[PDB]
Design a protein around this ligand. Structure first.
Ligand code: ADP
Lengths: 408, 180
Protein backbone atom coordinates (compact mmCIF):
# COMPACT_ATOMS: atom_id res chain seq x y z
CA UNK A 1 0.00 0.00 0.00
CA UNK A 2 0.83 3.88 -0.53
CA UNK A 3 0.52 6.67 2.28
CA UNK A 4 3.72 8.77 2.37
CA UNK A 5 4.12 11.47 5.00
CA UNK A 6 2.95 14.99 4.25
CA UNK A 7 6.43 16.17 3.42
CA UNK A 8 7.16 12.98 1.42
CA UNK A 9 4.06 13.89 -0.70
CA UNK A 10 5.34 17.39 -1.15
CA UNK A 11 8.89 16.48 -2.03
CA UNK A 12 7.97 14.30 -5.02
CA UNK A 13 5.89 17.24 -6.01
CA UNK A 14 8.73 19.81 -6.08
CA UNK A 15 10.02 17.19 -8.45
CA UNK A 16 7.80 18.44 -11.25
CA UNK A 17 5.99 21.57 -10.19
CA UNK A 18 8.34 24.57 -9.39
CA UNK A 19 7.25 26.59 -6.45
CA UNK A 20 3.69 27.19 -5.06
CA UNK A 21 4.69 25.37 -1.91
CA UNK A 22 1.57 26.32 -0.03
CA UNK A 23 -0.30 24.56 -2.77
CA UNK A 24 1.37 21.23 -2.59
CA UNK A 25 1.24 21.42 1.16
CA UNK A 26 -2.50 21.44 1.32
CA UNK A 27 -3.19 18.67 -1.27
CA UNK A 28 -0.81 16.44 0.71
CA UNK A 29 -2.55 17.43 3.98
CA UNK A 30 -5.68 16.13 2.21
CA UNK A 31 -4.10 12.96 1.10
CA UNK A 32 -2.89 11.94 4.51
CA UNK A 33 -6.16 13.24 6.19
CA UNK A 34 -7.33 10.59 3.72
CA UNK A 35 -5.06 7.76 4.88
CA UNK A 36 -5.51 8.69 8.56
CA UNK A 37 -9.20 7.83 8.36
CA UNK A 38 -8.89 4.22 7.40
CA UNK A 39 -6.78 3.72 10.44
CA UNK A 40 -9.74 4.35 12.87
CA UNK A 41 -12.68 2.10 13.23
CA UNK A 42 -16.04 1.77 11.56
CA UNK A 43 -17.82 4.68 13.30
CA UNK A 44 -15.35 7.24 12.17
CA UNK A 45 -14.34 5.30 9.00
CA UNK A 46 -17.69 6.57 7.83
CA UNK A 47 -18.30 9.90 9.61
CA UNK A 48 -15.10 11.69 8.34
CA UNK A 49 -15.20 13.38 5.04
CA UNK A 50 -12.64 13.59 2.22
CA UNK A 51 -10.99 16.94 2.86
CA UNK A 52 -11.73 18.39 -0.63
CA UNK A 53 -9.74 21.27 -1.96
CA UNK A 54 -10.36 24.74 -3.45
CA UNK A 55 -7.74 25.96 -5.73
CA UNK A 56 -7.80 29.66 -6.14
CA UNK A 57 -5.42 31.31 -8.68
CA UNK A 58 -4.27 32.59 -12.12
CA UNK A 59 -3.96 30.40 -15.06
CA UNK A 60 -1.07 28.13 -16.04
CA UNK A 61 0.74 28.08 -12.75
CA UNK A 62 -0.32 24.77 -11.95
CA UNK A 63 -3.53 24.07 -10.17
CA UNK A 64 -4.23 21.19 -12.71
CA UNK A 65 -0.70 19.70 -12.64
CA UNK A 66 -0.46 19.93 -8.96
CA UNK A 67 -3.49 17.73 -8.96
CA UNK A 68 -2.63 15.66 -11.95
CA UNK A 69 0.62 14.73 -10.37
CA UNK A 70 -0.45 14.38 -6.83
CA UNK A 71 -2.69 11.77 -8.15
CA UNK A 72 -0.19 9.86 -10.30
CA UNK A 73 1.96 9.21 -7.15
CA UNK A 74 -1.01 8.52 -5.00
CA UNK A 75 -1.36 6.18 -7.82
CA UNK A 76 -4.96 7.28 -7.70
CA UNK A 77 -7.26 7.06 -10.77
CA UNK A 78 -8.03 10.61 -11.88
CA UNK A 79 -10.13 12.94 -13.85
CA UNK A 80 -10.43 16.51 -14.67
CA UNK A 81 -13.86 17.69 -15.80
CA UNK A 82 -14.28 21.12 -17.01
CA UNK A 83 -17.09 22.92 -15.27
CA UNK A 84 -18.36 24.66 -18.37
CA UNK A 85 -19.44 21.39 -20.04
CA UNK A 86 -22.40 20.72 -17.82
CA UNK A 87 -23.73 24.10 -18.71
CA UNK A 88 -24.60 23.47 -22.39
CA UNK A 89 -25.71 27.07 -23.22
CA UNK A 90 -25.91 25.34 -26.64
CA UNK A 91 -28.65 23.55 -24.41
CA UNK A 92 -27.93 19.84 -25.10
CA UNK A 93 -28.22 17.57 -22.16
CA UNK A 94 -25.66 17.26 -19.45
CA UNK A 95 -25.88 14.83 -16.40
CA UNK A 96 -23.21 15.02 -13.77
CA UNK A 97 -23.10 11.40 -12.56
CA UNK A 98 -21.31 10.89 -15.82
CA UNK A 99 -18.10 12.27 -14.19
CA UNK A 100 -17.97 9.30 -11.82
CA UNK A 101 -18.51 6.95 -14.78
CA UNK A 102 -15.17 8.03 -16.42
CA UNK A 103 -13.40 7.76 -13.21
CA UNK A 104 -13.84 4.13 -13.73
CA UNK A 105 -13.15 3.99 -17.41
CA UNK A 106 -9.62 4.94 -16.61
CA UNK A 107 -9.78 2.98 -13.41
CA UNK A 108 -9.32 0.09 -15.86
CA UNK A 109 -7.26 1.06 -18.88
CA UNK A 110 -5.28 1.81 -15.81
CA UNK A 111 -5.71 -1.55 -14.00
CA UNK A 112 -5.10 -3.31 -17.30
CA UNK A 113 -1.90 -1.70 -18.42
CA UNK A 114 -0.67 -1.65 -14.78
CA UNK A 115 -0.90 -5.46 -14.99
CA UNK A 116 1.36 -5.96 -18.02
CA UNK A 117 4.74 -5.65 -16.43
CA UNK A 118 3.58 -7.19 -13.08
CA UNK A 119 2.26 -10.24 -14.95
CA UNK A 120 4.17 -9.80 -18.24
CA UNK A 121 7.64 -10.90 -16.98
CA UNK A 122 5.72 -13.69 -15.21
CA UNK A 123 4.58 -15.07 -18.67
CA UNK A 124 7.51 -14.77 -21.07
CA UNK A 125 8.73 -17.80 -19.10
CA UNK A 126 5.29 -19.40 -19.99
CA UNK A 127 5.34 -18.69 -23.76
CA UNK A 128 8.64 -20.41 -24.03
CA UNK A 129 7.31 -23.67 -22.37
CA UNK A 130 5.04 -23.54 -25.46
CA UNK A 131 7.81 -23.51 -28.06
CA UNK A 132 10.37 -25.63 -26.27
CA UNK A 133 7.55 -28.09 -26.61
CA UNK A 134 7.10 -28.01 -30.39
CA UNK A 135 10.76 -28.01 -31.50
CA UNK A 136 11.52 -30.99 -29.17
CA UNK A 137 8.75 -32.69 -27.10
CA UNK A 138 9.58 -33.90 -23.47
CA UNK A 139 8.94 -37.57 -24.38
CA UNK A 140 5.78 -39.16 -22.81
CA UNK A 141 5.62 -39.94 -18.98
CA UNK A 142 7.47 -37.39 -16.74
CA UNK A 143 9.07 -39.54 -13.89
CA UNK A 144 8.60 -36.74 -11.27
CA UNK A 145 11.77 -35.16 -9.86
CA UNK A 146 11.30 -31.58 -11.19
CA UNK A 147 15.13 -31.95 -11.86
CA UNK A 148 14.55 -34.21 -14.86
CA UNK A 149 12.71 -31.25 -16.35
CA UNK A 150 15.65 -28.88 -16.59
CA UNK A 151 17.03 -32.14 -18.13
CA UNK A 152 15.06 -32.02 -21.36
CA UNK A 153 17.32 -28.91 -21.50
CA UNK A 154 20.15 -31.19 -22.55
CA UNK A 155 19.38 -29.58 -25.87
CA UNK A 156 16.09 -27.97 -25.01
CA UNK A 157 17.80 -25.05 -23.20
CA UNK A 158 20.13 -24.91 -26.19
CA UNK A 159 17.10 -23.93 -28.21
CA UNK A 160 15.85 -21.61 -25.40
CA UNK A 161 18.96 -19.42 -25.78
CA UNK A 162 18.51 -19.82 -29.56
CA UNK A 163 15.07 -18.14 -29.51
CA UNK A 164 16.64 -14.75 -29.18
CA UNK A 165 18.80 -14.95 -32.36
CA UNK A 166 17.26 -17.37 -34.89
CA UNK A 167 13.52 -17.46 -35.59
CA UNK A 168 11.04 -17.22 -38.56
CA UNK A 169 10.46 -21.03 -38.79
CA UNK A 170 7.13 -22.75 -39.60
CA UNK A 171 5.48 -24.27 -36.46
CA UNK A 172 2.09 -25.06 -34.87
CA UNK A 173 1.30 -25.15 -31.22
CA UNK A 174 -1.29 -25.95 -28.52
CA UNK A 175 -11.61 -22.26 -27.84
CA UNK A 176 -7.82 -23.34 -27.71
CA UNK A 177 -6.07 -23.43 -31.15
CA UNK A 178 -5.00 -26.34 -33.56
CA UNK A 179 -3.42 -23.71 -35.91
CA UNK A 180 -0.51 -23.77 -38.41
CA UNK A 181 1.43 -20.44 -38.52
CA UNK A 182 5.09 -19.03 -38.27
CA UNK A 183 7.48 -18.06 -35.41
CA UNK A 184 7.96 -14.19 -35.24
CA UNK A 185 4.29 -14.12 -35.51
CA UNK A 186 3.23 -16.62 -32.80
CA UNK A 187 5.96 -15.23 -30.55
CA UNK A 188 4.02 -11.87 -30.77
CA UNK A 189 0.90 -13.95 -30.32
CA UNK A 190 1.15 -16.41 -27.48
CA UNK A 191 2.16 -13.51 -25.25
CA UNK A 192 -1.24 -11.87 -25.86
CA UNK A 193 -3.07 -15.19 -25.74
CA UNK A 194 -1.43 -15.79 -22.39
CA UNK A 195 -2.21 -12.66 -20.44
CA UNK A 196 -5.70 -14.29 -20.64
CA UNK A 197 -4.74 -17.19 -18.56
CA UNK A 198 -3.33 -14.51 -16.18
CA UNK A 199 -6.79 -14.51 -14.64
CA UNK A 200 -9.08 -11.60 -15.62
CA UNK A 201 -12.40 -12.44 -13.85
CA UNK A 202 -13.97 -10.27 -11.08
CA UNK A 203 -10.41 -9.14 -10.43
CA UNK A 204 -9.78 -6.62 -13.19
CA UNK A 205 -13.26 -5.29 -12.19
CA UNK A 206 -14.08 -5.64 -8.43
CA UNK A 207 -10.50 -4.28 -7.63
CA UNK A 208 -10.59 -1.69 -10.53
CA UNK A 209 -13.85 -0.77 -8.85
CA UNK A 210 -11.97 -0.79 -5.57
CA UNK A 211 -9.86 1.72 -7.54
CA UNK A 212 -12.21 4.58 -7.77
CA UNK A 213 -14.00 3.46 -4.57
CA UNK A 214 -10.69 3.37 -2.45
CA UNK A 215 -10.09 6.64 -4.24
CA UNK A 216 -8.80 8.75 -6.97
CA UNK A 217 -9.39 12.25 -7.36
CA UNK A 218 -11.50 14.52 -9.48
CA UNK A 219 -10.46 17.91 -10.38
CA UNK A 220 -13.60 19.95 -11.19
CA UNK A 221 -12.02 22.73 -13.24
CA UNK A 222 -13.11 26.21 -13.25
CA UNK A 223 -15.74 25.79 -10.66
CA UNK A 224 -15.93 29.67 -10.34
CA UNK A 225 -17.34 30.08 -13.82
CA UNK A 226 -20.41 28.24 -12.56
CA UNK A 227 -21.65 30.76 -10.03
CA UNK A 228 -23.30 33.98 -9.97
CA UNK A 229 -22.17 37.52 -8.97
CA UNK A 230 -23.96 39.52 -11.84
CA UNK A 231 -22.89 41.74 -14.84
CA UNK A 232 -20.43 40.08 -17.51
CA UNK A 233 -20.16 36.59 -15.65
CA UNK A 234 -23.84 35.96 -14.98
CA UNK A 235 -26.35 34.82 -17.74
CA UNK A 236 -28.89 33.06 -15.39
CA UNK A 237 -28.59 31.03 -12.25
CA UNK A 238 -29.13 28.50 -15.04
CA UNK A 239 -25.55 27.85 -14.05
CA UNK A 240 -26.11 27.99 -10.31
CA UNK A 241 -27.75 24.67 -11.04
CA UNK A 242 -24.59 22.93 -12.02
CA UNK A 243 -23.25 23.72 -8.54
CA UNK A 244 -26.37 21.97 -7.42
CA UNK A 245 -26.32 18.89 -9.54
CA UNK A 246 -22.68 18.63 -8.55
CA UNK A 247 -23.42 18.60 -4.85
CA UNK A 248 -24.22 14.96 -4.33
CA UNK A 249 -21.10 13.92 -5.98
CA UNK A 250 -18.97 15.69 -3.57
CA UNK A 251 -21.58 15.49 -0.85
CA UNK A 252 -21.97 11.68 -1.09
CA UNK A 253 -24.11 9.26 -3.22
CA UNK A 254 -23.98 6.07 -5.09
CA UNK A 255 -23.92 6.05 -8.85
CA UNK A 256 -24.96 3.78 -11.70
CA UNK A 257 -22.39 2.46 -14.08
CA UNK A 258 -20.77 0.02 -16.44
CA UNK A 259 -18.22 -1.98 -14.50
CA UNK A 260 -20.22 -1.92 -11.24
CA UNK A 261 -22.13 0.35 -8.92
CA UNK A 262 -19.71 3.00 -7.50
CA UNK A 263 -19.78 4.99 -4.23
CA UNK A 264 -18.74 8.71 -4.61
CA UNK A 265 -18.75 9.10 -0.88
CA UNK A 266 -15.08 8.96 -0.21
CA UNK A 267 -13.72 10.18 -3.64
CA UNK A 268 -11.41 13.16 -3.43
CA UNK A 269 -12.25 16.41 -5.10
CA UNK A 270 -10.12 19.25 -6.17
CA UNK A 271 -11.99 22.37 -7.39
CA UNK A 272 -9.95 24.86 -9.38
CA UNK A 273 -10.20 28.30 -10.97
CA UNK A 274 -9.42 31.86 -10.60
CA UNK A 275 -12.27 34.06 -9.51
CA UNK A 276 -11.39 37.34 -11.05
CA UNK A 277 -15.06 37.12 -11.78
CA UNK A 278 -16.47 36.14 -8.35
CA UNK A 279 -15.30 35.03 -5.11
CA UNK A 280 -15.24 31.59 -3.50
CA UNK A 281 -17.58 33.11 -0.98
CA UNK A 282 -19.84 32.80 -3.92
CA UNK A 283 -20.56 29.25 -4.25
CA UNK A 284 -23.84 27.75 -3.14
CA UNK A 285 -23.38 27.35 0.57
CA UNK A 286 -23.79 23.65 0.23
CA UNK A 287 -20.64 23.37 -1.99
CA UNK A 288 -19.00 26.20 -0.11
CA UNK A 289 -18.60 23.81 2.66
CA UNK A 290 -17.32 20.77 1.02
CA UNK A 291 -14.46 22.85 -0.02
CA UNK A 292 -12.94 22.99 3.48
CA UNK A 293 -9.37 23.38 2.44
CA UNK A 294 -8.81 26.64 0.53
CA UNK A 295 -5.42 27.69 -0.96
CA UNK A 296 -3.95 30.29 -3.22
CA UNK A 297 -1.34 29.95 -6.01
CA UNK A 298 0.50 33.06 -7.40
CA UNK A 299 1.87 33.79 -10.68
CA UNK A 300 5.25 32.39 -11.48
CA UNK A 301 8.40 34.37 -12.39
CA UNK A 302 10.87 34.78 -15.01
CA UNK A 303 13.05 32.89 -12.51
CA UNK A 304 10.19 30.55 -11.76
CA UNK A 305 10.37 29.95 -15.49
CA UNK A 306 13.98 29.62 -16.02
CA UNK A 307 13.54 27.02 -13.21
CA UNK A 308 10.60 25.27 -14.83
CA UNK A 309 12.71 25.21 -17.93
CA UNK A 310 15.39 22.97 -16.12
CA UNK A 311 14.52 21.85 -12.41
CA UNK A 312 11.49 19.81 -13.52
CA UNK A 313 12.66 16.35 -13.73
CA UNK A 314 11.03 15.71 -17.07
CA UNK A 315 12.42 19.06 -17.88
CA UNK A 316 11.20 20.66 -21.11
CA UNK A 317 14.67 21.50 -22.28
CA UNK A 318 15.68 17.93 -21.88
CA UNK A 319 12.81 16.71 -23.81
CA UNK A 320 14.91 18.62 -26.38
CA UNK A 321 18.38 17.28 -25.82
CA UNK A 322 17.14 13.70 -25.97
CA UNK A 323 14.63 14.19 -28.74
CA UNK A 324 17.09 16.20 -30.58
CA UNK A 325 19.92 13.61 -29.83
CA UNK A 326 18.18 10.93 -31.64
CA UNK A 327 19.21 12.61 -34.93
CA UNK A 328 22.79 12.71 -33.86
CA UNK A 329 22.83 16.05 -32.20
CA UNK A 330 24.06 17.03 -28.84
CA UNK A 331 22.32 20.26 -27.83
CA UNK A 332 23.23 22.28 -24.81
CA UNK A 333 21.36 25.25 -23.31
CA UNK A 334 23.47 27.93 -21.52
CA UNK A 335 22.60 29.42 -18.18
CA UNK A 336 22.26 32.50 -20.27
CA UNK A 337 19.88 31.44 -22.80
CA UNK A 338 17.70 29.50 -20.47
CA UNK A 339 17.75 33.05 -19.27
CA UNK A 340 16.50 34.72 -22.39
CA UNK A 341 14.34 31.64 -23.16
CA UNK A 342 12.31 32.62 -20.07
CA UNK A 343 12.97 36.30 -20.43
CA UNK A 344 10.90 36.04 -23.68
CA UNK A 345 8.16 34.04 -22.26
CA UNK A 346 7.72 36.77 -19.86
CA UNK A 347 7.95 39.60 -22.14
CA UNK A 348 5.53 37.96 -24.52
CA UNK A 349 3.08 36.96 -21.93
CA UNK A 350 3.00 40.58 -20.84
CA UNK A 351 1.90 42.13 -24.17
CA UNK A 352 -0.49 39.93 -25.86
CA UNK A 353 -2.15 38.01 -22.99
CA UNK A 354 -0.42 35.84 -20.43
CA UNK A 355 -1.26 32.13 -20.57
CA UNK A 356 1.07 30.85 -17.85
CA UNK A 357 4.12 28.66 -17.93
CA UNK A 358 2.28 27.84 -20.98
CA UNK A 359 4.18 30.16 -23.25
CA UNK A 360 7.60 28.45 -22.71
CA UNK A 361 6.29 25.38 -24.54
CA UNK A 362 5.38 27.46 -27.62
CA UNK A 363 8.31 29.83 -27.36
CA UNK A 364 10.63 26.88 -27.51
CA UNK A 365 9.33 24.55 -30.17
CA UNK A 366 9.89 27.80 -32.15
CA UNK A 367 13.43 28.32 -31.08
CA UNK A 368 14.20 24.92 -32.50
CA UNK A 369 12.20 25.19 -35.77
CA UNK A 370 15.53 25.81 -37.36
CA UNK A 371 17.48 22.95 -35.37
CA UNK A 372 14.45 20.63 -34.92
CA UNK A 373 14.15 20.54 -38.69
CA UNK A 374 17.66 20.52 -40.16
CA UNK A 375 18.56 18.02 -37.32
CA UNK A 376 19.02 14.87 -39.33
CA UNK A 377 21.69 16.71 -41.11
CA UNK A 378 23.72 17.58 -38.06
CA UNK A 379 24.65 13.83 -37.67
CA UNK A 380 27.11 14.33 -34.89
CA UNK A 381 27.45 18.16 -35.28
CA UNK A 382 26.85 19.81 -31.90
CA UNK A 383 25.20 23.10 -30.88
CA UNK A 384 25.49 25.71 -28.38
CA UNK A 385 22.15 27.27 -27.56
CA UNK A 386 22.54 30.48 -25.75
CA UNK A 387 21.45 34.03 -25.38
CA UNK A 388 23.09 35.31 -28.59
CA UNK A 389 21.36 32.39 -30.26
CA UNK A 390 17.98 32.77 -28.76
CA UNK A 391 17.77 36.46 -29.61
CA UNK A 392 18.61 35.89 -33.18
CA UNK A 393 15.50 33.91 -33.74
CA UNK A 394 13.52 35.68 -31.14
CA UNK A 395 13.80 39.34 -30.27
CA UNK A 396 11.89 40.32 -33.50
CA UNK A 397 8.82 38.31 -32.99
CA UNK A 398 8.52 39.13 -29.41
CA UNK A 399 9.23 42.39 -31.18
CA UNK A 400 6.32 42.14 -33.54
CA UNK A 401 3.59 41.87 -30.92
CA UNK A 402 0.92 41.27 -33.55
CA UNK A 403 2.82 38.40 -34.97
CA UNK A 404 3.32 36.82 -31.58
CA UNK A 405 -0.39 37.17 -31.45
CA UNK A 406 -0.48 34.43 -34.09
CA UNK A 407 2.53 32.42 -33.66
CA UNK A 408 3.53 32.41 -29.94
CA UNK B 1 -34.84 66.76 -10.70
CA UNK B 2 -31.51 64.77 -10.07
CA UNK B 3 -28.56 64.45 -7.63
CA UNK B 4 -25.50 66.54 -8.69
CA UNK B 5 -22.11 65.10 -9.47
CA UNK B 6 -19.43 65.08 -6.58
CA UNK B 7 -16.35 66.81 -7.42
CA UNK B 8 -13.17 64.78 -7.65
CA UNK B 9 -9.71 65.64 -8.46
CA UNK B 10 -6.76 63.52 -9.18
CA UNK B 11 -3.22 64.75 -9.56
CA UNK B 12 0.29 63.35 -10.04
CA UNK B 13 3.23 65.56 -9.03
CA UNK B 14 7.02 64.86 -8.44
CA UNK B 15 6.02 61.22 -8.44
CA UNK B 16 3.37 61.42 -5.79
CA UNK B 17 -0.08 60.26 -6.85
CA UNK B 18 -3.12 61.84 -5.35
CA UNK B 19 -6.93 62.04 -5.44
CA UNK B 20 -9.12 64.55 -3.56
CA UNK B 21 -13.01 64.74 -3.74
CA UNK B 22 -15.77 66.72 -1.96
CA UNK B 23 -18.54 65.21 0.13
CA UNK B 24 -21.39 67.59 -0.83
CA UNK B 25 -24.44 65.84 -1.96
CA UNK B 26 -26.52 68.30 -3.71
CA UNK B 27 -29.98 66.96 -4.47
CA UNK B 28 -32.61 68.70 -6.64
CA UNK B 29 -31.90 72.30 -7.80
CA UNK B 30 -30.63 73.66 -4.60
CA UNK B 31 -31.19 71.26 -1.75
CA UNK B 32 -28.44 69.51 0.04
CA UNK B 33 -29.07 66.13 1.53
CA UNK B 34 -25.56 65.12 2.90
CA UNK B 35 -22.21 66.88 3.64
CA UNK B 36 -19.63 63.91 3.59
CA UNK B 37 -19.70 60.88 0.99
CA UNK B 38 -16.68 58.45 0.07
CA UNK B 39 -16.51 58.06 -3.75
CA UNK B 40 -12.64 57.85 -3.82
CA UNK B 41 -11.68 54.24 -3.22
CA UNK B 42 -8.37 52.40 -3.10
CA UNK B 43 -8.28 49.54 -5.50
CA UNK B 44 -6.06 46.59 -6.00
CA UNK B 45 -3.88 46.28 -3.01
CA UNK B 46 -3.59 50.07 -2.65
CA UNK B 47 -2.02 50.05 -6.07
CA UNK B 48 -4.61 52.25 -7.70
CA UNK B 49 -6.62 55.27 -6.90
CA UNK B 50 -10.02 55.52 -8.43
CA UNK B 51 -12.61 57.94 -7.82
CA UNK B 52 -16.00 57.91 -9.43
CA UNK B 53 -18.37 60.76 -9.61
CA UNK B 54 -21.68 59.10 -9.40
CA UNK B 55 -24.09 56.78 -7.71
CA UNK B 56 -22.66 54.25 -5.41
CA UNK B 57 -24.50 51.53 -7.08
CA UNK B 58 -23.09 52.83 -10.36
CA UNK B 59 -20.04 53.63 -8.33
CA UNK B 60 -19.38 50.37 -6.58
CA UNK B 61 -20.46 48.70 -9.89
CA UNK B 62 -18.00 50.25 -12.24
CA UNK B 63 -15.21 49.82 -9.72
CA UNK B 64 -15.20 46.02 -9.76
CA UNK B 65 -15.42 45.77 -13.54
CA UNK B 66 -12.25 47.84 -13.29
CA UNK B 67 -10.93 45.47 -10.77
CA UNK B 68 -11.84 42.33 -12.53
CA UNK B 69 -10.20 43.65 -15.61
CA UNK B 70 -7.12 44.91 -13.83
CA UNK B 71 -6.35 41.42 -12.51
CA UNK B 72 -7.57 40.17 -15.91
CA UNK B 73 -4.29 41.94 -17.02
CA UNK B 74 -1.72 42.07 -14.19
CA UNK B 75 -1.31 45.89 -13.71
CA UNK B 76 -1.98 47.56 -17.13
CA UNK B 77 -4.23 50.36 -16.52
CA UNK B 78 -4.35 51.58 -20.10
CA UNK B 79 -5.33 48.08 -21.22
CA UNK B 80 -7.98 47.65 -18.59
CA UNK B 81 -9.03 51.20 -18.86
CA UNK B 82 -9.78 50.44 -22.37
CA UNK B 83 -11.44 47.09 -21.98
CA UNK B 84 -13.80 48.68 -19.49
CA UNK B 85 -14.72 51.37 -21.93
CA UNK B 86 -15.68 48.81 -24.34
CA UNK B 87 -17.75 47.24 -21.54
CA UNK B 88 -19.27 50.43 -20.30
CA UNK B 89 -19.86 51.85 -23.80
CA UNK B 90 -21.79 48.77 -24.68
CA UNK B 91 -23.76 48.00 -21.49
CA UNK B 92 -27.37 49.48 -21.89
CA UNK B 93 -27.46 50.84 -18.39
CA UNK B 94 -24.06 52.36 -17.93
CA UNK B 95 -23.49 53.50 -21.58
CA UNK B 96 -26.17 56.11 -20.92
CA UNK B 97 -24.40 56.95 -17.64
CA UNK B 98 -23.32 60.58 -17.27
CA UNK B 99 -20.14 60.81 -15.14
CA UNK B 100 -16.68 59.59 -15.72
CA UNK B 101 -14.03 57.52 -14.02
CA UNK B 102 -10.71 58.62 -12.76
CA UNK B 103 -8.21 55.93 -12.57
CA UNK B 104 -4.49 56.31 -11.82
CA UNK B 105 -1.52 54.14 -10.83
CA UNK B 106 2.01 54.46 -9.52
CA UNK B 107 2.92 55.62 -13.00
CA UNK B 108 0.15 57.11 -14.99
CA UNK B 109 -3.44 58.49 -15.35
CA UNK B 110 -6.78 58.12 -17.04
CA UNK B 111 -10.18 59.52 -17.74
CA UNK B 112 -12.66 56.88 -18.62
CA UNK B 113 -16.02 57.62 -19.89
CA UNK B 114 -19.35 56.08 -20.16
CA UNK B 115 -19.08 56.88 -23.88
CA UNK B 116 -16.03 54.80 -24.44
CA UNK B 117 -13.51 57.50 -24.39
CA UNK B 118 -10.23 57.04 -22.57
CA UNK B 119 -8.20 60.03 -21.98
CA UNK B 120 -4.69 60.88 -21.06
CA UNK B 121 -3.82 64.19 -19.46
CA UNK B 122 -0.72 65.56 -20.79
CA UNK B 123 0.15 67.23 -17.52
CA UNK B 124 -0.78 64.75 -14.91
CA UNK B 125 -3.92 66.41 -13.71
CA UNK B 126 -7.39 65.06 -14.18
CA UNK B 127 -10.67 66.24 -12.74
CA UNK B 128 -14.29 65.29 -12.64
CA UNK B 129 -17.68 66.23 -11.37
CA UNK B 130 -19.38 69.42 -10.23
CA UNK B 131 -16.63 71.94 -9.69
CA UNK B 132 -14.38 69.96 -11.90
CA UNK B 133 -13.12 72.73 -13.97
CA UNK B 134 -12.76 75.03 -10.99
CA UNK B 135 -10.46 72.54 -9.29
CA UNK B 136 -8.79 71.82 -12.70
CA UNK B 137 -8.10 75.31 -12.80
CA UNK B 138 -6.72 75.21 -9.39
CA UNK B 139 -4.69 72.06 -10.08
CA UNK B 140 -2.89 73.01 -13.29
CA UNK B 141 -2.52 76.33 -11.66
CA UNK B 142 -0.59 75.38 -8.63
CA UNK B 143 1.61 72.75 -10.31
CA UNK B 144 2.68 75.29 -12.97
CA UNK B 145 3.10 77.73 -10.09
CA UNK B 146 4.21 76.37 -6.78
CA UNK B 147 5.33 72.95 -7.92
CA UNK B 148 8.44 73.29 -5.85
CA UNK B 149 6.53 75.10 -3.01
CA UNK B 150 3.94 72.33 -2.67
CA UNK B 151 3.17 68.62 -2.78
CA UNK B 152 1.11 66.08 -4.60
CA UNK B 153 -1.23 65.40 -1.71
CA UNK B 154 -1.29 69.18 -0.97
CA UNK B 155 -2.03 70.50 -4.42
CA UNK B 156 -5.03 68.20 -4.62
CA UNK B 157 -6.36 69.00 -1.28
CA UNK B 158 -6.34 72.53 -2.25
CA UNK B 159 -7.92 71.98 -5.62
CA UNK B 160 -11.19 70.99 -4.03
CA UNK B 161 -10.79 73.69 -1.46
CA UNK B 162 -10.85 76.41 -4.15
CA UNK B 163 -13.67 74.72 -5.94
CA UNK B 164 -16.05 74.91 -2.92
CA UNK B 165 -15.19 78.55 -2.78
CA UNK B 166 -16.34 79.51 -6.28
CA UNK B 167 -18.69 76.48 -6.59
CA UNK B 168 -22.13 75.95 -5.07
CA UNK B 169 -22.03 72.14 -5.78
CA UNK B 170 -18.75 71.61 -3.94
CA UNK B 171 -18.19 71.70 -0.22
CA UNK B 172 -15.31 72.04 2.30
CA UNK B 173 -15.19 68.42 3.73
CA UNK B 174 -12.52 66.79 1.31
CA UNK B 175 -11.46 63.08 1.11
CA UNK B 176 -7.81 62.51 0.30
CA UNK B 177 -6.02 59.55 -0.96
CA UNK B 178 -2.54 58.78 -2.12
CA UNK B 179 -0.35 55.79 -2.99
CA UNK B 180 3.12 54.98 -1.53
N1 ADP C 1 4.43 26.13 -10.97
C1 ADP C 1 4.81 25.42 -12.00
N2 ADP C 1 5.84 24.55 -11.87
C2 ADP C 1 6.11 23.66 -12.89
N3 ADP C 1 5.39 23.60 -14.06
C3 ADP C 1 4.35 24.46 -14.18
C4 ADP C 1 4.05 25.38 -13.16
N4 ADP C 1 2.97 26.09 -13.54
C5 ADP C 1 2.58 25.66 -14.76
N5 ADP C 1 3.42 24.64 -15.18
C6 ADP C 1 3.36 23.86 -16.45
O1 ADP C 1 2.87 24.68 -17.50
C7 ADP C 1 1.55 24.27 -17.79
C8 ADP C 1 0.59 24.77 -16.69
O2 ADP C 1 0.12 23.76 -15.79
P1 ADP C 1 -1.46 23.62 -15.41
O3 ADP C 1 -1.36 22.91 -14.11
O4 ADP C 1 -2.38 22.85 -16.43
O5 ADP C 1 -1.93 25.19 -15.31
P2 ADP C 1 -3.12 25.81 -14.45
O6 ADP C 1 -3.61 24.83 -13.49
O7 ADP C 1 -2.41 26.87 -13.62
O8 ADP C 1 -4.29 26.30 -15.33
C9 ADP C 1 1.62 22.78 -17.73
O9 ADP C 1 2.35 22.31 -18.85
C10 ADP C 1 2.34 22.70 -16.40
O10 ADP C 1 2.80 21.38 -16.26
Amino acid sequence: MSEMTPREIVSELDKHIIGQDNAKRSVAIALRNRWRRMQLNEELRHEVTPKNILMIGPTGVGKTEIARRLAKLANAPFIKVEATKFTEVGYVGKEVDSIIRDLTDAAVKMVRVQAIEKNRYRAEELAEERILDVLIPPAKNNWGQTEQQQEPSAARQAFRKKLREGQLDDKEIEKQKARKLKIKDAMKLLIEEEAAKLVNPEELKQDAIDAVEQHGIVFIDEIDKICKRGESSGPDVSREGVQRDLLPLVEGCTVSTKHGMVKTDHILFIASGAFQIAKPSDLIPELQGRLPIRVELQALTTSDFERILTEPNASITVQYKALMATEGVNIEFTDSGIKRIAEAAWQVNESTENIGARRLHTVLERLMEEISYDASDLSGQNITIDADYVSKHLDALVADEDLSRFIL
Amino acid sequence: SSFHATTIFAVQHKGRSAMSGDGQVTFGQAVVMKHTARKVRKLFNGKVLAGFAGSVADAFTLFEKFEAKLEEYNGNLKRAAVELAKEWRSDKVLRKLEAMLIVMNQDTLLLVSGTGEVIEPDDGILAIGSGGNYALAAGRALKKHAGESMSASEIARAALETAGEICVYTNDQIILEELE
